[PDB]
């Protein structure tokens, strides 16, 4: 401990040992492990530059077959990977397990992870169909908190959903200590430093420290599709988006949906002082949020759907060179703490340092924006049911089923009531007993509405209707 | 009831099984009746009619393999499956070879399992479990009794899974089922290859899947040196991506009774009793035996492979036959111990599944560290007996002490050679025994022995180091 004491004294963090004599050896060793693992010199520096750092006026608006084929070709060449921002405990949904494990009550009861996995396997199959060889889209999954072990167990239980273990790469995001307004690391307990994830922009520090870009390079990957786990409609490894970005020579790309409600909680892609960035929804004034352009659309209408494209060379530069130049954002927090007694604070007593995944768009030499349709591509799981009526399991399950219902109609199929009366595209729900059409199509059958003609063309179905690898089921 | 059974028996040419029915007490009749009704005589005849009717294996990372095996164990992804002449009627697991500790083979195995759980916890930081599947035969109740009395040697009841393999009737050379007693069919276990059928029948692979098991280490009960759930073997098999693996030692004596791993363009073991002397003696240009990969009855199976075995491969396994001297009751009602073999037992062999492996690997180990089987009673042929078994274990642990920096001394305090000369017929080899709870394979001995010296017998256990006096 005299080497540790010295390290702590040099950094001005020697209060971290103040309960040492009150701990049993079991507990002392876990503190020791925690402290020995930290870079106190670096942390003081991060704090100092974060505090030094501690918008609307400078914001300005953002003014196909070949794409899909290009994307499928890149997939077929083993040149595409995906990187999943898997998040931490699903505390915003009222659960401790990560969001990828959430079951929104689809007819199949499939989790978000399973749907995403089946989308990946599907594209591998489609590419093999068009270009003739077996191909691989590796799946890099960044977990946070300490959800990694349970995520691995979940995947193993499900046999990686038909993917191969060797092509799913789990890695866990680092944590930073909470700091007081004086820059002192806060003990949560006598034997425990208070620690927290450093935001999804902690991705970059984590890729660097764990040599993840080097694995992509070894595999020969060129394009990375970064996406958020919470969106049930997400077009994982979307070949149209990948082809778009490849043909534009993008180093970085972002998908957006049209924001139509001023107070929708989406970051807006815009230019600030000439450069591309996402301005977070909690940063803009209501005046900026509500500004309309002459067509009547919102001026800032490019809503960030957390779906990005990076080339591997750009990611390498971000990880090795750029992100280290960015200072952390300060967020004040109520941090539970221990002289002698365990206290829960009624007001913020400390700072969490964080970065966001979109903070490095500013470094892109060729940034591009790809607009998509909300109903086909963006239905996020953000909230518990009944919290605010939006972005919850009910809206998520209904968005997917609505989408699949539309696929069936567009492929020439029809839904009928119990008398064989064909239902409208938009049915009237008038009695307490009426429910929307329940339709669920596995990604193994259809990625984006293609390939349904043998299943549904010129046929009538009574919902609920499930289409999957075992056929067509009317429940 | 009886006139119907008789017709069933008559159709199968087995009606002699009722020979003594007119002399049996009522309760005796009920028991024989229940035995016979459960048998499928058509199938048995079919088994009997079929049953009665090579290329060499082309020949450091040890720590990396061990670490991977420990990681599998730490994730609860490893289980072991125990396959369970000495002149005793009780199962071999209960045999006491006369170690200083007097521990039975079962106890030594149990403590190896407990040890690895602890070692994997030390390595990776979480508590973990290695389920122990124990395949018995119709040994089952005695084995369970024994374990319960010893409180599972410190393991949890719920992680020791006893299951009973099938039995087959002994049959004459003419395919007639043999009566052991006037009201009892002579039954024997169907070979250690009976594992696969039993797995399918009792949904054991479902159980492995439910538990989250990925790798099974299958091993023979009789080897006092057996590295139960050996993390090196498991790790090797994991890194090679094998579905199936077999541990071997180098066979150097042509007539050693070990099966030999070979290719027959697929992997097999050819049992020692099926090889010609010519094949057994053949030597390659380096002077080693051409067929030198001796099967030590230690196998690796992935659970997906066992799933494929249960789903697809298990039905194609063949019965081996062996001529046996089967105790019987003659046509005069006399109990006879036959002067000449009088029938056959049909048996499957556990290694016959290797022909279905797509990624089969062989892992060579050192005999002195890993293989000292208990096959024979002490006087019978000078080999593979309680004496050799006990001395092999004590020699190993002696080597562990020296390798860890300790020394043995004589009664005057003088250092003994690694290989001392025996002085007279009353002299003894160094006696040393180290509990598996202290050391699984020679690790963790520094604090006990490094730069210390010991007068044998030396025991090291959870109560420390003991010079016996
Ligand atoms: C910083 C960020 O990403 N902002 C994006 C976000 O905002 P939004 O503020 O809604 O993001 P969340 O609140 O969904 O995510 C922030 C981070 O919080 C963590 N977390 C969140 C919920 C939870 O139950 N557990 C948990 O650990 C995750 O690490 C996650 O990556 O998604 C939207 C699209 O839907 C926006 O348009 C984006 O600008
Ligand atoms: C078929 C077999 O494995 N042969 C092996 C065997 O022969 P070996 O002829 O000496 O012995 P066995 O076939 O009896 O097999 C030994 C193991 O199988 C178990 N058992 C046996 C019969 C049964 O119906 N059920 C059952 O579980 C025994 O309890 C024991 O644990 O061990 C040697 C190594 O020492 C050989 O190199 C092997 O080729």
| Cβ count near B142 (within 10 Å) | 14
Which atom of ligand 2 is the closest one to the Cα of B82?
Answer: 31
Structural tokens at position A244? 């778009």
Chain B residue numbers touching A157 (CB-CB < 8 A): 212
Chain B residue numbers touching A153 (CB-CB < 8 A): 75, 212
Using the CB atoms, write b or e for B68-78: b if 16+ within 10 Å: bbbbbbbbbbb
Same domain, A407 and A424: no
CA distance B2 to B201: 29
Is A156 part of the contact surface with chain B (CB cutoff 8 Å)? Answer: yes
| Cβ count near A407 (within 10 Å) | 22
Cβ proximity of A100 and A151 under 8 Å? yes
Ligand minimally distant from the alpha carbon of residue B246: 2
Give me Rg for the CA atoms of chain B.
24
Structural tokens at position B341? 């073999």
In this structure, which residue's CA is closest to atom 36 in ligand 2? B258
Q: Report CA(A382)–ligand 1 centroid distance (Å).
A: 8
Which residues span the domain enclosing B444?
406-469
Going by C-alpha positions, the residue among A374, A373, A372, A392 that lies closest to residue A382 is A392
Chain A residue numbers touching B212 (CB-CB < 8 A): 153, 156-157
| CA-to-CA dists, residue B92 to B105, B196, B208, angstroms | 7, 22, 26
Using the CB atoms, write b or e for B226-243: b if 16+ within 10 Å: bbbbbbbbbbbbbebebb
Q: Is B265 exposed, middle or buried (0-12, 13-18, 19+ CB in 10 A)?
A: exposed
Same domain, B325 and B466: no
Which atom of ligand 1 is the closest one to the Cα of A92?
Answer: 24
Ligand minimally distant from the alpha carbon of residue A102: 1
Residue A304 Cβ < 6 Å to ligand 1 = yes
The residue whose CB lies within 8 Å of the most ligand 2 atoms, and thus the one to mutate among B80, B81, B83, B195, is B83
Cβ proximity of A311 and A213 under 8 Å? no
Distance of CA A80 to the CA centre of its chain: 18
| Cβ count near A282 (within 10 Å) | 7
Residue where a domain terminates, one of A361, A379, A412: A412
Cβ proximity of B355 and B349 under 8 Å? no
Q: Is the peptide bond before B89 cis (omega within 30 degrees of 0)?
A: no
Q: Report CA(A378)–ligand 1 centroid distance (Å).
A: 14
HSE value, Cβ hemisphere, 13 Å, CA-based, for B284 = 12
End-to-end CA distance of chain B: 69
Preferred mutation among A156, A160, A170 to probe B, highest tally of B CBs within 10 A: A156
Phi-psi region of A3 (alpha: psi -120 to 50; beta: other; left: phi over 0): alpha
Q: Is A210 exposed, middle or buried (0-12, 13-18, 19+ CB in 10 A)?
A: middle
CA distance A303 to A274: 19
Q: Which residues of B fall in the annotated binding site for UDP-N-acetyl-alpha-D-galactosamine?
A: 83, 165, 191-192, 220-221, 259, 271-272, 295, 375, 423
Q: Report CA(B192)–ligand 2 centroid distance (Å).
A: 6
CA distance B94 to B221: 10
Same domain, B383 and B436: no
Going by C-alpha positions, the residue among A254, A222, A235, A205 that lies closest to residue A364 is A254
- 3-class secondary structure for chain B? CHHHHHHHHHHCCCHHHHCCHHHCCHHHHHHHHHHHHCCCHHHHHHHHHHHCCCECCCCCCHHHHHHHHHHHHHCCCEEEEEECCCCCCCCHHHCECCCCCCCEHHHHHHHHHHHHHHHHHHHHCCCCCCCEEEEECCCHHHHHHHHHHCHHHHCCHHHEEEEECCEEECECCCCCECEEECCEECEEECCHHHHHHHHHHCCHHHHHHHHCCCEEEEEECCECCCCCCCHHHHHHHHHHCCCEEEEEEECCCCCCCCCEEEECCCEEEECHHHCCHHHHHCECCCCCECCCEEEEEEEEEEHHHHHHHHHHHHHHCCCEEEEECCCEECCCCCEECCCCCCEEEEECCHHHHHHHCCCEEEEECCHHHHCCECCCCCCCCCCCCHHHHHHHHHHHHHHHHHHCCCEEECCCCCECCCCCCCCCCCCCCCCEEECCCCCCCCCCCHHHHCCCEECCCEEEECCEEEECC
Which atom of ligand 2 is the closest one to the Cα of B271?
Answer: 39
Is A30 part of the contact surface with chain B (CB cutoff 8 Å)? Answer: no
CA distance B195 to B201: 10
Same domain, A73 and A90: yes
A42 is in an annotated binding site: no
Cβ proximity of B183 and B32 under 8 Å? yes
Torsional sign, CA B25, B28, B32, B37 = positive
CA distance B290 to B285: 9
CA distance B147 to B48: 36
CA distance B31 to A254: 79
| Cβ count near A363 (within 10 Å) | 19
Going by C-alpha positions, the residue among A9, A10, A346, A335 that lies closest to residue A178 is A335
Q: How far is A364 from chain B (nearest CA, A)?
A: 40
Is B305 part of the contact surface with chain A (CB cutoff 8 Å)? Answer: no
Is B382 part of the contact surface with chain A (CB cutoff 8 Å)? Answer: no
Rounded to the nearest 5°, which phi and psi values hold at B237?
A: -65, -40
CA distance A421 to B333: 82
Same domain, A386 and A312: yes
In this structure, which residue's CA is closest to atom 1 in ligand 2? B349
Q: Tally C-beta pairs within 8 A across A and B.
A: 6
Torsion angle, CA of B211/B216/B222/B227, rounded to 10 degrees? Answer: -100
Residue bearing tokens 């979109």: A358
| CA-to-CA dists, residue B192 to A221, B82, B123, B324, B372, angstroms | 49, 10, 35, 17, 19
Structural tokens at position B264? 């027959």
Going by C-alpha positions, the residue among A296, A301, A305 that lies closest to residue A284 is A301
Cβ proximity of B373 and B223 under 8 Å? yes
Say whether A153 and B212 touch across the interface (CB within 8 A): yes
CA distance B167 to B445: 45
Torsional sign, CA B377, B380, B385, B388 = positive
Torsion angle, CA of A408/A372/A92/A43, rounded to 10 degrees? Answer: 150
Same domain, B304 and B162: yes
Structural tokens at position B451? 């730069």
A199 is in an annotated binding site: yes
Cβ proximity of B408 and B401 under 8 Å? yes
Antiparallel, parallel or unpaired: β A195-197 and A275-279: unpaired
In this structure, which residue's CA is closest to atom 7 in ligand 2? B258
Q: Which residues of B fall in the annotated binding site for UDP-N-acetyl-alpha-D-glucosamine?
A: 83, 165, 191-192, 220-221, 259, 271-272, 295, 349, 375, 423
Same domain, A242 and A338: yes
CA distance B88 to B95: 9
Rounded to the nearest 5°, which phi and psi values hold at A357?
A: -60, -35
Torsion angle, CA of A217/A220/A223/A229, rounded to 10 degrees? Answer: -70
Is B71 part of the contact surface with chain A (CB cutoff 8 Å)? Answer: no
Residue A333 Cβ < 6 Å to ligand 1 = no
Q: Report CA(B91)–ligand 2 centroid distance (Å).
A: 13
HSE value, Cβ hemisphere, 13 Å, CA-based, for A397 = 18
Going by C-alpha positions, the residue among A92, A136, A84, A140 that lies closest to residue A112 is A84
| CA-to-CA dists, residue A325 to A25, A205, B385, angstroms | 41, 11, 72
Going by C-alpha positions, the residue among A252, A223, A271 that lies closest to residue A322 is A252
CA distance A152 to B281: 51
Same domain, B296 and B440: no
Is B214 part of the contact surface with chain A (CB cutoff 8 Å)? Answer: yes
Rounded to the nearest 5°, which phi and psi values hold at A327?
A: -85, 155
Torsional sign, CA A313, A136, A200, A218 = negative
Cβ proximity of A237 and A122 under 8 Å? no
Torsion angle, CA of B383/B384/B389/B393, rounded to 10 degrees? Answer: 90
| Cβ count near A410 (within 10 Å) | 13
Q: Which residue of B has its CA nearest to A159?
A: B304
CA distance B436 to B229: 13
Same domain, B429 and B351: no
Last residue before each gap in chain B (C to N over 2.5 A): 53, 59, 84, 138, 264
Q: Which residue of A has its CA nearest to B210?
A: A157
CA distance B10 to A463: 59
HSE value, Cβ hemisphere, 13 Å, CA-based, for A181 = 6
What is the maximal distance between C-alpha atoms in chain B? 82
Residue where a domain terminates, one of B356, B379, B405: B405
Ligand minimally distant from the alpha carbon of residue B143: 2
CA distance B170 to B319: 13
* Total domains, chain A: 2
HSE value, Cβ hemisphere, 13 Å, CA-based, for A285 = 8
Q: Is the peptide bond before B457 cis (omega within 30 degrees of 0)?
A: yes
Give me Rg for the CA atoms of chain A.
25
- 3-class secondary structure for chain A? CHHHHHHHHHHCCHHHHCCHHHCCHHHHHHHHHHHHCCCHHHHHHHHHHHHHHCCHHHEECCCCHHHHHHHHHHHHCCCEEEEEEEECECHHHCCCCEHHHCECCCCCCCEHHHHHHHHHHHHHHHHHHHHCCCCCCCEEEEECCCCHHHHHHHHHHCHHHHCCHHHEEEEECCEEECEECCCCECEEECCEECEEECCHHHHHHHHHHCCHHHHHHHHCCCEEEEEECCECCCCCCCHHHHHHHHHCCCCEEEEEEECCCCCCCCCEEEEECCEEEEECCCCCCHHHHHCECCCCCECCCEEEEEEEEEEHHHHHHHHHHHHHHCCCEEEEECCCECCCCCECCCCCCEEEEECCHHHHHHHCCCEEEEECCHHHHCCECCCCCCCCCCCCHHHHHHHHHHHHHHHHHHCCCEEECCCCCECCCCCCCCCCCCCCCCEEECCCCCCCCCCCHHHHCCCEECCCEEEECCEEEEC
Residues 6+ apart with CB under 8 A from B150: B107
Residue A266 Cβ < 6 Å to ligand 1 = yes
Residue A356 Cβ < 6 Å to ligand 1 = yes
CA distance A121 to A259: 31
Going by C-alpha positions, the residue among B431, B433, B440 that lies closest to residue B460 is B433
| Residues found in chain A | 475
Is B212 part of the contact surface with chain A (CB cutoff 8 Å)? Answer: yes
CA distance B361 to B227: 18
Residue where a domain terminates, one of B359, B384, B405: B405
Residue bearing tokens 């090579």: B54
| Cβ count near A131 (within 10 Å) | 14
Same domain, A313 and A462: no
Structural tokens at position A345? 């604070």
Same domain, A152 and A181: yes
Is A153 part of the contact surface with chain B (CB cutoff 8 Å)? Answer: yes
| CA-to-CA dists, residue A221 to A81, A118, A131, A241, angstroms | 7, 21, 18, 16
Going by C-alpha positions, the residue among A251, A242, A262 that lies closest to residue A310 is A251
Cβ proximity of A10 and A42 under 8 Å? no
| Cβ count near B114 (within 10 Å) | 18
Q: Report CA(B335)–ligand 2 centroid distance (Å).
A: 29
Q: How far is A149 from chain B (nearest CA, A)?
A: 9
Resolution of the coordinates, Å: 1.7
Going by C-alpha positions, the residue among B245, B234, B232 that lies closest to residue B443 is B232
Same domain, A318 and A286: yes
Which atom of ligand 2 is the closest one to the Cα of B135?
Answer: 27
Distance of CA A115 to the CA centre of its chain: 15
Cβ proximity of B367 and B225 under 8 Å? no
């Amino acid at each position: 401990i005299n080497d540790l004491k010295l390290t702590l004294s040099k950094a001005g963090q020697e209060h971290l040992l103040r309960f040492w004599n009150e701990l049993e050896e079991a507990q002392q060793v876990e503190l020791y492990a925690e402290l020995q693992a930290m870079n106190f010199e670096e942390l003081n520096f991060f704090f100092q530059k974060a505090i030094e750092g501690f918008v609307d006026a400078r914001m300005e608006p953002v003014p196909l077959q070949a794409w899909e084929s290009e994307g499928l070709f890149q997939i077929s060449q083993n040149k595409v990977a995906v990187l999943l921002l898997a998040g931490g405990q699903g505390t915003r949904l009222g659960v401790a397990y990560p969001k990828g494990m959430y079951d929104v009550g689809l007819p199949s009861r499939k989790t978000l992870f399973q749907i995403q996995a089946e989308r990946i396997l599907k594209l591998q199959q489609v590419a093999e169909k068009y270009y003739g060889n077996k191909c691989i889209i590796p799946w890099y999954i960044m977990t946070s908190g300490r959800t990694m072990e349970s995520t691995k167990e979940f995947f193993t239980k499900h046999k990686y959903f038909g993917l191969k273990k060797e092509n799913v790469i789990f890695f866990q995001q680092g944590m930073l200590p909470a700091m007081s307004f004086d820059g002192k690391i806060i003990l949560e307990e006598k034997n425990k430093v208070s620690m927290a994830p450093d935001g999804n922009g902690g991705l970059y520090r984590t890729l660097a420290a764990q040599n993840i870009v080097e694995d992509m390079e070894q595999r020969g990957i060129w394009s990375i599709h970064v996406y958020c786990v919470d969106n049930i409609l997400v077009k994982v490894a979307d070949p149209r988006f990948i082809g778009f970005c490849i043909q534009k020579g993008a180093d970085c790309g972002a998908k957006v949906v049209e924001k139509t409600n001023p107070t929708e909680p989406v970051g807006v892609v815009c230019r600030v002082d000439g450069v591309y960035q996402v301005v977070e929804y909690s940063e803009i004034s209501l005046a900026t949020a509500q500004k309309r352009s002459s067509d009547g659309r919102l001026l800032f209408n490019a809503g960030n759907i957390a779906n990005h494209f990076f080339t591997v060379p750009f990611l390498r530069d971000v990880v090795n060179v750029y992100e280290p130049q960015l200072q952390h954002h300060v967020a004040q927090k109520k941090i539970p703490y221990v002289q002698g007694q365990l206290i829960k604070p009624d007001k913020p007593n400390g700072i969490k340092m964080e970065k966001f995944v979109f903070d490095i768009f500013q470094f892109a030499k060729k940034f591009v924006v790809y607009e998509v349709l909300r109903e086909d591509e963006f239905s996020p799981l953000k909230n518990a049911d009944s919290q605010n009526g939006k972005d919850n399991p009910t809206t998520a399950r209904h968005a997917l089923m609505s989408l699949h219902h539309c696929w069936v109609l567009n492929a020439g199929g029809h839904f009928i009531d119990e008398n064989g009366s064909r239902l409208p595209a938009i049915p009237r729900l008038k009695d307490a007993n009426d429910v929307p059409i329940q339709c669920e199509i596995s990604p193994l059958i259809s990625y984006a509405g293609e390939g349904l003609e043998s299943y549904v063309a010129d046929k009538e179905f009574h919902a609920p209707l499930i289409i999957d690898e075992n056929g067509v089921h009317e429940l």
